[PDB]
Each structure stands twice: as C-alpha cells, then as structure tokens.
Amino acid sequence: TCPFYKKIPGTGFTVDAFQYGVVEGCTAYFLTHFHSDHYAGLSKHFTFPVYCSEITGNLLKNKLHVQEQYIHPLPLDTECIVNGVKVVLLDANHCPGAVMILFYLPNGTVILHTGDFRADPSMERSLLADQKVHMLYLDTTYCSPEYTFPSQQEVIRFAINTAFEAVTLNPHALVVCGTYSIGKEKVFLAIADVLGSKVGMSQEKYKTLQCLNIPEINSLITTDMCSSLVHLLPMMQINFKGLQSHLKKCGGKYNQILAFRPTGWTHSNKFTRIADVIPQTKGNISIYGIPYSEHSSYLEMKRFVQWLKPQKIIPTVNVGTWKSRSTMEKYFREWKLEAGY
Ligand code: NI
C-alpha cells in the first residue's frame, strides 16, 4: 500500500507512486524523474494524469509508450495550477529532467518535495528564497557524516586527464564507460570531447539520450561503434570477463581497455583523495571506480536544510529500518540546534 511519505496532505496528489495500483484518493500522479525505482508501474495502459518535466515527459511517451493525452509536462521555474493548487518545478541537479516540486496548499502551508537531488548553493537563488517551507520531503540517501565526496567538476577533471593520457600513450586503447539509467552523462561526453571522438552505444541507449534535448547531441553520440573510441556498456558488463568479451568483439581494432564505473560513494573516499585513486588491473584491462554522485553528500544536505529552516522534515530514503530512521532524526536535531531554528 502507498507509503505515507509519497502522499501530499490536503491534496489529491502522490509523488513517485506508480507501483501500488490505483491509490485510494489520488486525482494526480507526480513523477520527479525517470529512474526505475520511481517510475515502476507506468505503462501504455496507465490512464491517470501524470505531471512531470518536459524531459521526463519525452521519455514516458517514447520509452514506456504512455499515451500522450495523460502526460502533462510543465516548464521549470513557473507558477502553474493543478486541480486548483499552485505548483512549481525546480531543477534537482540529479539526472536529466529531474525536478523538485513546491506545493502551495490552499490553507497556506507550503511543501517542498526534493525528489532525488544533489543540493547546491545555486538553489538558494531560485523561487525557494522568497518564502517559508513548513514540510520538506528530503532525499536522505547519504545522510551520514562518513559520506563525503568531491565535486562533480574535480571527478571529471580526473577522468579527462586519465583518459587523455592513456590514449595518447597507446592510440590503440579503447575507453569504456558504464551506465544503467539516465544520468552521469557528463562523464562519457567530457571524455569523448577531449579525445575528438563520439560516444558509441546500442540503439536503445541512443534512443534514450535523443529524448533529452542535449545541445548538439547528434555531434556527441552514435550507434556506429567502429568509428568511436569511447564505448558505453551496461554497468553489469564492467568487470574483467565482460570487458575481455567486448574487446573480442572489436576485431583487433583495439589491444587495451581503460574503463570507468561511476559509482555514488565507495569507502575508498574515507581514506583516499581523488588525485590518489588507482584502478584494478588484470592483463590489458584497467577498471577505475570514480565517486561521481548525483545525490547530496552529508555536508551539502546539511547546509541545504539549515539554509531552508523547514518546520518538519520527512525522510524519503533509508526509511526501512529503525536504526536508520533513528540515526537520521538525531542529525536533524543537531542541524536544528546548531542553526538555532
Ligand atoms: Ni534517482
């Protein structure tokens, strides 16, 4: 049955609640972003109104074959009305098309649902600055002080330099980058760009990125693997057997793979700086795990909340265990008491 944290009180609204059939008393279904845990249950046969971003809308039409008359895409940073309730979509700095949702209830309460997000100081100059928030439905994915990671910028700087070095030293080396859902595109595109190559991929994944409105995307991506020296594969294939397999398929066009697994966090971040990362190697294959997160770090999260000073916080992630819930409520109390709200 739909959990309480996916229901917006005093509205007929749900957020990311498509896996519970017809939810009792839901007149409108919100979808923050196109990841499987959140869209789980959508299909062509869905006949309720879905509200989402333009990009998330394109992917619902094309990838899931949802009928067009049920997709209500909304522009960002714009006051819209839905079943007589004022709403706004803000950029979540997650994956493409991903949004946070502000709800202005008729009684005067104001609710921010972050969806999935990576908190940034640039959010403190959106429509969020203008007014108070009573409730915050917070993506608490890395809600613990051990979760630290570098900026997306430094991680990219690392990947670029690394990849440029390897391929200048060996022109017959192939770069491979792992993917399983939309998001993390800057990794593979920045590497392609610095190498003067396009990114080769499967047709299904080429179709997916074509939905997103990237600038000059046709310039960046392709389905001709032969003409490319940056390949994308499923994340599952990023291991020594998978990569040896794929190397075989390229027919003596390459003799070496360098490969990246963009993960969220790894316990190597507790001990090791980004400059100090090294790969796993077996034969002519090297695999780098890099900490490119699309979620808030502990510190970014804490700052975001202390800036916003919400009256109540409802966690949306890691809620399934009593020790987790409890550890989060402790940090929430620290953040409140430190900041004096
Ligand atoms: Ni997500």
Token pair for 28: 């409108």
The answer to whether the CB of 226 falls within 8 A of the CB of 142 is no
**Residue 182 alpha carbon to ligand 1 centre in Å:** 9
**Residue 46 alpha carbon to ligand 1 centre in Å:** 22
The secondary structure of residue 227, as a DSSP letter, is T
**Residue 237 alpha carbon to ligand 1 centre in Å:** 21
**Residue 315 alpha carbon to ligand 1 centre in Å:** 15
Measured in angstroms, the resolution is: 2.6
Tell me how far CA of residue 5 lies from CA of 13, 152, 252, in angstroms: 12, 29, 53
Provide the edge-to-edge strand list for the sheet that holds 110-113. 80-82, 85-91, 99-104, 110-113, 135-138, 312-315
**Residue 35 alpha carbon to ligand 1 centre in Å:** 5
Torsion region of 240: left, alpha or beta (phi above 0 gives left; psi -120 to 50 gives alpha) = alpha
Check the CA dihedral 112-116-120-126 and report its sign. Answer: negative
Q: Among all chains, which residue has been given the structure tokens 């979540």?
A: 92
**159 CB-near residues (< 8 Å, 6+ apart):** 187, 190, 191, 260, 288, 290
The answer to whether the CB of 42 falls within 8 A of the CB of 21 is no
Say how far apart CA 70 and CA 50 lie, in whole Å.
Answer: 6
**Residue 169 alpha carbon to ligand 1 centre in Å:** 37
The answer to whether the CB of 231 falls within 8 A of the CB of 201 is yes
Classify strands 230-234 and 312-315 as parallel, antiparallel or unpaired: unpaired
Say how far apart CA 90 and CA 119 lie, in whole Å.
Answer: 12
Q: Among all chains, which residue has been given the structure tokens 């999260």?
A: 301
**Residue 34 alpha carbon to ligand 1 centre in Å:** 8
Domains of the chain: 1-147+296-341 (3.60.15.10), 148-295 (3.40.50.12650)
**Residue 189 alpha carbon to ligand 1 centre in Å:** 20
Q: Can you name the residues that pair with 256 across neighbouring β-strands?
A: 173
**Residue 252 alpha carbon to ligand 1 centre in Å:** 38
User: In a 3-state reduction of DSSP, which class is residue 144?
Assistant: coil
Three-state SS for 114-174 is CCCCCCCHHHHHCHHHHCCCCEEEECCCCCCCCCCCCCHHHHHHHHHHHHHHHHHHCCCEE
Q: How many other β-carbons are positioned within 10 Å of the β-carbon of residue 64?
A: 13
Say how far apart CA 293 and CA 288 lie, in whole Å.
Answer: 15
User: In a 3-state reduction of DSSP, which class is residue 52?
Assistant: strand
**Residue 297 alpha carbon to ligand 1 centre in Å:** 14
- The structure was resolved experimentally with X-ray
**Residue 104 alpha carbon to ligand 1 centre in Å:** 24
Q: How many other β-carbons are positioned within 10 Å of the β-carbon of residue 161?
A: 11
**Residue 32 alpha carbon to ligand 1 centre in Å:** 9
The answer to whether the CB of 207 falls within 8 A of the CB of 62 is yes
Say how far apart CA 52 and CA 29 lie, in whole Å.
Answer: 9
Q: Can you name the residues that pair with 282 across neighbouring β-strands?
A: 285
Say how far apart CA 189 and CA 100 lie, in whole Å.
Answer: 25
**Residue 67 alpha carbon to ligand 1 centre in Å:** 23
**Residue 33 alpha carbon to ligand 1 centre in Å:** 7
The answer to whether the CB of 87 falls within 8 A of the CB of 101 is yes
Say how far apart CA 191 and CA 157 lie, in whole Å.
Answer: 9
334 exposure class (CB count in 10 Å sphere: 0-12, 13-18, 19+): exposed
**Residue 14 alpha carbon to ligand 1 centre in Å:** 17
Q: How many residues are there in the chain?
A: 341
Token pair for 328: 């989060």
The answer to whether the CB of 243 falls within 8 A of the CB of 235 is no
- Residue type (1 letter), 257: I
- Side-chain half-sphere CA neighbours of 132 within 13 A: 7
The answer to whether the CB of 232 falls within 8 A of the CB of 199 is yes
Check the CA dihedral 12-16-22-24 and report its sign. Answer: negative
Q: Among all chains, which residue has been given the structure tokens 């027919």?
A: 251
Nearest CA among 243, 198, 205 for reference residue 225: 198
H helices present in the chain, as ranges: 36-39, 54-62, 152-169, 185-194, 203-210, 217-220, 240-249, 268-271, 298-308, 322-339
**Torsion angles phi and psi, residue 255, rounded to 5:** -120, 5
In 123-156, which positions are buried (b, 16+ CB within 10 angstroms) versus exposed (e)?
beeeebeeeebebbbbbbbbbbeebebbebeebb
**Residue 279 alpha carbon to ligand 1 centre in Å:** 26
